[PDB]
Amino acid sequence: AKPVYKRILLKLSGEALQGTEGFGIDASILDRMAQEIKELVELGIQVGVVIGGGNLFRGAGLAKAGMNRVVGDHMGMLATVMNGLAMRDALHRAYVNARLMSAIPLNAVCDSYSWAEAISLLRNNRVVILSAGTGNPFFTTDSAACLRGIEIEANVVLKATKVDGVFTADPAKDPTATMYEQLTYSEVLEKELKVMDLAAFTLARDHKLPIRVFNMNKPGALRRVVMGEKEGTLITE
Amino acid sequence: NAKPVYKRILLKLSGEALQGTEFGIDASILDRMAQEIKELVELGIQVGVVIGGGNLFRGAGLAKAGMNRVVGDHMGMLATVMNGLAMRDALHRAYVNARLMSAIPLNAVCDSYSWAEAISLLRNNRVVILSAGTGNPFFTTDSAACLRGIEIEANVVLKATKVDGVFTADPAKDPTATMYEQLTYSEVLEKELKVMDLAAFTLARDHKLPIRVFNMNKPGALRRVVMGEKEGTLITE
Amino acid sequence: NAKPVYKRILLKLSGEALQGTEFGIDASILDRMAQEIKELVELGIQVGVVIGGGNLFRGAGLAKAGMNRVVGDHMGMLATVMNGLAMRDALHRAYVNARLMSAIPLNAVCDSYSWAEAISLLRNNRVVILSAGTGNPFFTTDSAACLRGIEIEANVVLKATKVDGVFTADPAKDPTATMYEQLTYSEVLEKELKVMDLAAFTLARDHKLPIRVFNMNKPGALRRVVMGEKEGTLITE
Amino acid sequence: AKPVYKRILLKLSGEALQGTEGFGIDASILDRMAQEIKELVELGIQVGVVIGGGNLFRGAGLAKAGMNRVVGDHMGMLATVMNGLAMRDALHRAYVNARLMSAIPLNAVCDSYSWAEAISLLRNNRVVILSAGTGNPFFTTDSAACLRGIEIEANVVLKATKVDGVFTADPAKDPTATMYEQLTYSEVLEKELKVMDLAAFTLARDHKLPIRVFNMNKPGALRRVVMGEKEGTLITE
Amino acid sequence: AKPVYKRILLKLSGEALQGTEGFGIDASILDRMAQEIKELVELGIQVGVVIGGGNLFRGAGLAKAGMNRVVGDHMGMLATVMNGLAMRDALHRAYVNARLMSAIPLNAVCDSYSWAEAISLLRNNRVVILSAGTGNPFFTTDSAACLRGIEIEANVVLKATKVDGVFTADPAKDPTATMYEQLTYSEVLEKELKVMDLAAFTLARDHKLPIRVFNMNKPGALRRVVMGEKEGTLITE
Amino acid sequence: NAKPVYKRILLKLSGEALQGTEFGIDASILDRMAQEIKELVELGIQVGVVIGGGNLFRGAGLAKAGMNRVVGDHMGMLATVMNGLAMRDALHRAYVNARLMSAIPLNAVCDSYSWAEAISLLRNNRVVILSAGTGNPFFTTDSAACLRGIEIEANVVLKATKVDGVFTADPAKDPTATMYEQLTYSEVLEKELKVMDLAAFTLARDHKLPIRVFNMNKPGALRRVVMGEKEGTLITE
Numbered sequence A, D, E: 001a002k003p004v005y006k007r008i009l010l011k012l013s014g015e016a017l018q019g020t021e022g023f024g025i026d027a028s029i030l031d032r033m034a035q036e037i038k039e040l041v042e043l044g045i046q047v048g049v050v051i052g053g054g055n056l057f058r059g060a061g062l063a064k065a066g067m068n069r070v071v072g073d074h075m076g077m078l079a080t081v082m083n084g085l086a087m088r089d090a091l092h093r094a095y096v097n098a099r100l101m102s103a104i105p106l107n108a109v110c111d112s113y114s115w116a117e118a119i120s121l122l123r124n125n126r127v128v129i130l131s132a133g134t135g136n137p138f139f140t141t142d143s144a145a146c147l148r149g150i151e152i153e154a155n156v157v158l159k160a161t162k163v164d165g166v167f168t169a170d171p172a173k174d175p176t177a178t179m180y181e182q183l184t185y186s187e188v189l190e191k192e193l194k195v196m197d198l199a200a201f202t203l204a205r206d207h208k209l210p211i212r213v214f215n216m217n218k219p220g221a222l223r224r225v226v227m228g229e230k231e232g233t234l235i236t237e
Numbered sequence B, C, F: 001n002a003k004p005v006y007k008r009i010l011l012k013l014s015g016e017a018l019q020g021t022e023f024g025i026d027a028s029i030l031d032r033m034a035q036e037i038k039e040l041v042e043l044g045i046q047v048g049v050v051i052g053g054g055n056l057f058r059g060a061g062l063a064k065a066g067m068n069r070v071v072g073d074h075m076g077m078l079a080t081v082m083n084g085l086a087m088r089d090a091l092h093r094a095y096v097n098a099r100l101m102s103a104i105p106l107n108a109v110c111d112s113y114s115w116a117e118a119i120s121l122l123r124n125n126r127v128v129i130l131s132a133g134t135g136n137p138f139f140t141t142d143s144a145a146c147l148r149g150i151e152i153e154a155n156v157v158l159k160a161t162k163v164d165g166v167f168t169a170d171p172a173k174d175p176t177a178t179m180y181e182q183l184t185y186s187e188v189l190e191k192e193l194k195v196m197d198l199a200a201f202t203l204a205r206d207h208k209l210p211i212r213v214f215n216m217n218k219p220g221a222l223r224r225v226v227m228g229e230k231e232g233t234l235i236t237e
């Protein structure tokens, strides 16, 4: 009963790190994710992780408050980096070899994203955190996830969410919605389901980047997914 | 026919003063400070501005939750940049020439701190924002405020806080908390009042750098200081 | 007493359009575009220009020959810079204030892309060339053209190609290839015409960013577009 | 009889490298320090070394000659880097794994200071040289020593000096002064003894960073100190 | 019958990578050179490789077309980098440990040239590619070859050419010319033979950097040269 | 009504000429050169200035003492920057617009060398100092002086030494040492005189770049050269 993936791209949204107040970072959560990621690395899995920033800032939201869209998306990106810092530290304190790279060159705090070094690091059993997303405004860390996954030739992008997977509708606002166990792009687009930003998904589809949606707040789920069990939704075609 | 009592200042904007209820950044406070800073610039005053990050993260805070103290300060310093980004945008949208420099090289998002480049810019009547403080862990922005304040040879360091001046304690927690209106670097010590952190204080005292503590949540407060009018607490030799 | 119909544009110069017979760069086309760009600048038009690299390398091309797709796009992106270098030189030798920025930091050879710095420069009537496109593999310059076009808030993206406009096919290969003169982001799709690559197209549609496709191998073509005269194909909502 | 320290921060003043003319660097001295440092690394000790610049330049001294204080401190910092280069080379020629990092980003000659990589390097038995001090003007490499020591969580900062330790007065200008074998901050400050720049010391005290003053020109002293013998003065509290 | 060189500097001209059209890169050729370089590394040889850009651009040629000489040499340098990218990829796909460094800092695509790291990498059996030449205009990659060879203390610079070696004249335009098996600088200069740019050669002579000219299109030649056989011409004194 | 005989020059200031008795930098010589350079700038002369480091370190010197030659040149090159820092400060304190660029990127302390940026600056009547010479080991600043001199298209390279002109030997060591007042790149060779180092000399000869050697320890010497008056030795074709 060994793992069914060699290299994966873990997409961690900003919310995932949110405590109970709705903002910031919750030390306890980070530590738990570190233990889970750790188990995967021990299991011989090469882990790349793209983190979001919803717990701190979103360019759109700021833009609405009157701020320039580009600068909003910049601050939002810096936020992803601020999260990566937290994730990395947790990994380190748990004695897991990891390194933070940023699309937005941030000398001192971490090194800049380098596809070459990224791969080398991956082939050396080190967790590689890709913050600052794609580095461009008008994009979501989800795109970053798909882009970085195609780049590092990940076997699959695991989209962590506070939900067991993809439902016929929002399973928290419509007690009728049912989860899917298997899905294909054409279907997701056909029935117009919510998996992620269209651009990021279009890209994943264009390169047949399998996507799996699972719940990150469900202890063990991560492991079950990589160990090929019944967890969340699978997206391919 | 009054006219300003200062030629070039070092304005320290505390991050906490950018919250405006509930963490995050308060767009409206930002828009207001751009206006008040705009007036000073039209008034011919050169403005260097050190910004804090208390509204997002404090190294020490994170450390107690378990994070590595040094990574905590890094996140903290990165918050100042995030705040420096929003403050610059407010300036720009108010049509005020401003540039953002960071102690830790961000590149692209903003400029790296360049002492010489900062002097030139101030001379050409442009607001120079300094984020990432001193750029070293274990220090505060108050320290940077003094350090940069001396570097650019500012006439005084205006510490913009949330209260009218230096009090005998947190006026929000101790009903028995009075503020002073005059202090010598001595008195502050021979009374051990809450102004900054000895390291920064000593620095200013060392170079006979006056300090004035005032409230930025008070519209027009800054201008009054600039016009030499009864405002906040003055700290001199 | 006509005068320009645009204040600030995003000129996308395809690399292939710089060949002029046999790969490489055609000095004479370069000298000519500097002249036509010089007129627009004297005409008061702010010019941001995204340049391609089709005359030297295309990631996808190299990939089929066996190279790593990502290293291929890198080479590709580096070609755009090489083209950005020659275009800037032509501008300079024509006495036109121009600066070259790269998505991937070259430093020394040219400047790193700085959104803010780009806005300032355009405002001071200086040509801002953007090379290395989006700076990420798997994307085209057309994408960058739209991405940057939106960033600097350009009035329109002028895609400078080798043909008079968007055709039903490659007019050089399909004798049955007609071009249109008007299209809605819709029609382009509900006809599936050759304009760009959905990713870039969608982007422009998303932000109601008009696009006009014209021939740069036609001396004076650009100016006519700028003067709002029957030229190329117009793509709007 | 094994070592009593696991990780130490070696503070080497500029003078230490001075030949007999009073300036520059003396090849012979460097080589000797390299052999001693080497022995420590072989002994399993993780060594971090902060070097000064007194043998070349001091910002204050230059300032007095009329030069700007900030630029003086800059040149002085560059000097620390110039020394590090020399120290590193010596370490390399003696086949000791070492790396120079600079607070002032100096691409090519060495890499920039990165707390993360610094620690990783330390955990890999490599000597880590921290030049350019803290990177800020108005500071001494002594502060840098204390700051870098607290950061890398060094077990103790060993302050090398051309004296056996801390005396009741200058043991070279008052034949009565006696050396201390043990001291505490409060005492040093109480009797106002000379250990180092007040700021650097205040910082060390604030974080209980044990400090040991010993003679670097006394062959073997370094080893005796780390091997817990009767050498120089100890400072804790 | 083991190798007679421990560390070599392989000078690969741009032409060497040229397909049959006269320009660009030929995937097939790269792959073959990768296999040969691979054999050398397996053989315990430390390989440093300086690549040219003649297959893409030469500053002089561009200058003649009217472009600024400096910018011409810049684009030409970027070309060397574009080749290095190709060479590196080939090495990687052939599972040979290699790294591209550039004299012209090119963050992301590769790292910048660092003599220190270069040597460390060499001592670790990794191919080190030195692109962007010397980094200065008015120089040839040949100089770069000699300069980088003296720096990395290479045992010899192997100048690959599409000719078996150095002839009394051009062996392709004068069927009488004969190849030399052994030569000395004084002789090359005396009889004024074509080996490389005078500057690069003067430098090599000044430091007694043995030079060997051989044919790179002659499968096995590389190996024969390093295995001390009868191949090409030797240049020393 | 004389007026200058040059529009733009390349002033090579030897480091040794900044000692003024005993190594180090002589504040008074610095203050004097700022004045003499100030006059040239007010006189409308564009000034690019290559600075040496002979007063602090010479790679070759260190090499003989045992250091790695390459690390020696690095230290050497870093001295030029240190000298470039003090010279810029003198300029600034004399109210002369000046910028310092380094061949090896220092960032923050000064600017990276930017050919284009240097041309723009000279055109806007600002002194552009070039430190770190060519930025490569094994070369001298004299080389950089010629290399940069050609790059910026200077009218002549003024080598500022410690003696009145090119002598038949060191006038301080050989009583039988006469200087010339006219030389052809030829004579210099067909007499093998002490002007620079063939590499740099050849370079200037290559591009018909005249050279004039004069004494900077002679107040007003520079201006006389600039005014085309009997001063130093002239080296032309």
Ligand SMILES: O=c1ccn([C@@H]2O[C@H](COP(=O)(O)OP(=O)(O)O)[C@@H](O)[C@H]2O)c(=O)[nH]1
Residues within 6 Å of the ligand: A012, A013, A014, A015, A051, A052, A053, A054, A055, A057, A058, A059, A060, A072, A073, A074, A075, A076, A077, A078, A080, A132, A133, A134, A135, A136, A137, A138, A139, A140, A141, A142, A143, A144
């Ligand atoms: O490629 C990217 C990735 C992120 N962002 C910005 O940074 C924020 C990151 O938060 P995101 O919404 O992607 O994170 P998550 O929703 O996953 O918590 C976004 O809101 C954007 O403003 C961006 O502009 N481009």
Ligand SMILES: O=c1ccn([C@@H]2O[C@H](COP(=O)(O)OP(=O)(O)O)[C@@H](O)[C@H]2O)c(=O)[nH]1
Residues within 6 Å of the ligand: B013, B014, B015, B016, B017, B051, B052, B053, B054, B055, B057, B058, B059, B060, B072, B073, B074, B075, B076, B077, B078, B080, B132, B133, B134, B135, B136, B137, B138, B139, B140, B141, B142, B143, B144
């Ligand atoms: O020189 C500096 C300045 C700031 N910080 C960190 O960044 C935070 C900035 O917030 P600060 O408390 O200075 O802001 P304010 O109190 O002014 O709101 C600090 O708590 C530190 O963790 C740092 O480490 N070094």
Ligand SMILES: O=c1ccn([C@@H]2O[C@H](COP(=O)(O)OP(=O)(O)O)[C@@H](O)[C@H]2O)c(=O)[nH]1
Residues within 6 Å of the ligand: C013, C014, C015, C016, C017, C051, C052, C053, C054, C055, C057, C058, C059, C060, C072, C073, C074, C075, C076, C077, C078, C080, C132, C133, C134, C135, C136, C137, C138, C139, C140, C141, C142, C143, C144
């Ligand atoms: O955002 C970008 C823009 C370009 N490229 C690469 O660089 C080449 C640039 O040529 P492009 O086809 O964009 O130029 P054009 O078609 O306009 O001649 C592309 O083929 C890609 O390989 C890239 O990877 N990312």
Ligand SMILES: O=c1ccn([C@@H]2O[C@H](COP(=O)(O)OP(=O)(O)O)[C@@H](O)[C@H]2O)c(=O)[nH]1
Residues within 6 Å of the ligand: D012, D013, D014, D015, D051, D052, D053, D054, D055, D057, D058, D059, D060, D072, D073, D074, D075, D076, D077, D078, D080, D132, D133, D134, D135, D136, D137, D138, D139, D140, D141, D142, D143, D144
């Ligand atoms: O954090 C620092 C460290 C050093 N320096 C400057 O660089 C010199 C380094 O010499 P220092 O006196 O620290 O060295 P040492 O006395 O140990 O020989 C100082 O004089 C300062 O001018 C600085 O400004 N800040």
Ligand SMILES: O=c1ccn([C@@H]2O[C@H](COP(=O)(O)OP(=O)(O)O)[C@@H](O)[C@H]2O)c(=O)[nH]1
Residues within 6 Å of the ligand: E012, E013, E014, E015, E051, E052, E053, E054, E055, E057, E058, E059, E060, E072, E073, E074, E075, E076, E077, E078, E080, E132, E133, E134, E135, E136, E137, E138, E139, E140, E141, E142, E143, E144
């Ligand atoms: O130190 C160097 C190396 C290269 N180049 C430029 O980049 C090109 C590289 O091609 P080169 O002729 O050196 O390559 P090869 O002849 O070996 O194919 C040259 O033509 C120059 O324009 C340069 O200016 N300086």
Ligand SMILES: O=c1ccn([C@@H]2O[C@H](COP(=O)(O)OP(=O)(O)O)[C@@H](O)[C@H]2O)c(=O)[nH]1
Residues within 6 Å of the ligand: F013, F014, F015, F016, F017, F051, F052, F053, F054, F055, F057, F058, F059, F060, F072, F073, F074, F075, F076, F077, F078, F080, F132, F133, F134, F135, F136, F137, F138, F139, F140, F141, F142, F143, F144
């Ligand atoms: O292109 C350069 C210029 C200088 N240097 C080094 O830095 C020192 C600078 O001093 P130089 O002798 O050029 O100065 P000057 O003789 O003009 O006083 C040299 O000795 C070299 O070690 C170098 O390696 N490369």
